[PDB]
Amino acid sequence: SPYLLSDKEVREIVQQSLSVGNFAARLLVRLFPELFTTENLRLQYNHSGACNKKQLDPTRLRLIRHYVEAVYPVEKMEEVWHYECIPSIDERCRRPNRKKCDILKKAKKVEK
Amino acid sequence: VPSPYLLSDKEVREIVQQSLSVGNFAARLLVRLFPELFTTENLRLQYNHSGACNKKQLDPTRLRLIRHYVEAVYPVEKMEEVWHYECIPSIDERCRRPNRKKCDI
DNA sequence: TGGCCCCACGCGGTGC
DNA sequence: GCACCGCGTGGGGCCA
DNA sequence: TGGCCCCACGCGGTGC
DNA sequence: GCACCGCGTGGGGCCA
């Protein structure tokens, strides 16, 4: 399809997203820019065409669904492992036995 | 390669219980799976996960195994009902959201 | 306590 | 410059 | 702050 | 009736 976003940009949106719902909402603005001008064409639309409103382009809405169900959970785990587990593993490997300040306080007290 | 490094469900569950967070959980698995680096000789100091900063690289086989346990205890979010019950309401809300709140107007 | 552990964070290095 | 990556560091809570 | 943003929720309409 | 569906609404968190 033509309205494809880059893998890297999609990952960025996942990271910036506050929740899965907010993640979809961000993709909506990113993929439907014409509705989100200061003209607020967005107000004439919803996802289904309910309440006498126009229906959001189901092609792009199906793409948003794809990112939510196929990419979003994988990128959320990927970002947890890389940003939390890996830093913690490295910290544990390089952690000193005694702090630099605790060593110097002993170095001072022992000679004073 | 790992016959001994293979942890049972009971052993993994115990490590989860003493760990304070997912990150700390990964750190404990590191100690549990790399006992030779965490002796009083502190060979751990020559290593990190990638081999950056002139350090040696942790065995990527066991490091992948640590990942496996981390995602085995803290798995993927099953998005089954999420699209219909969370995303769709948010999409409609964003489409109808007013510029100013009415209480502020 | 005071020692061990966890994690947050300013930092310099890297690399384009 | 700036996005990214591990370091050294110390506040701080738990524990024995 | 105050503007932007997010999301929860009572509500009437719809449709079986 | 009743389960379901988008609406209009306002409490509240983030930020510069």
Residue A58 is assigned to a structural domain of this protein = yes
The answer to whether A21 contacts chain B (CB < 8 Å) is yes
| CA-to-C1' span, A50 to F4 (A) | 13
Nearest to A89 among B27, B78, B90 (CB): B27
* B contact test, residue of A18, A54, A56, A85 with most B CBs within 10 A: A85
Separation CA B26–CA B19 (nearest Å): 9
Residue A1 is assigned to a structural domain of this protein = no
From chain A, pick out residues whose CB is under 8 angstroms from the CB of B83. Answer: 24, 65, 68-69
Residue with tokens 């593993």: A89
Domain residue limits at B63 = 9-76
Separation CA A93–CA A54 (nearest Å): 57
Separation CA A14–CA A16 (nearest Å): 6
Dihedral sign computed on CA atoms, order B97, B98, B100, B102: negative
Q: What is the distance in angstroms between the CA of the first residue and the CA of the last residue of chain B?
A: 68
Calculated CA dihedral for residues A90, B34, B12, A75, nearest 10 degrees? 40
Residue B65 is assigned to a structural domain of this protein = yes
Residue B70 is assigned to a structural domain of this protein = yes
Residue B1 is assigned to a structural domain of this protein = no
Residue with tokens 């999420």: B82
Dihedral sign computed on CA atoms, order A11, A16, A17, A23: negative
Query: With contact defined as beta carbons under 8 Å apart, do B23 and A85 qualify?
Result: yes
CA angle, A68 as apex, A66 and A74 as ends, to 5°? 100
Task: Give the tokens for residue A73.
Answer: 């959970």
Residue A101 is assigned to a structural domain of this protein = yes
Of the candidates B57, B27, B15, the one whose C-alpha atom is nearest the C-alpha of residue A81 is: B27
Query: With contact defined as beta carbons under 8 Å apart, do A25 and B85 qualify?
Result: no
Separation CA B52–CA A101 (nearest Å): 26
Domains in chain A: how many in total?
1
Residues in chain A, overall count: 112
Residue B97 is assigned to a structural domain of this protein = no
CA angle, A18 as apex, A13 and A23 as ends, to 5°? 45
Classify residue B56 as exposed, middle or buried by CB count within 10 Å of its CB (0-12, 13-18, 19+): exposed
Residue A2 is assigned to a structural domain of this protein = no
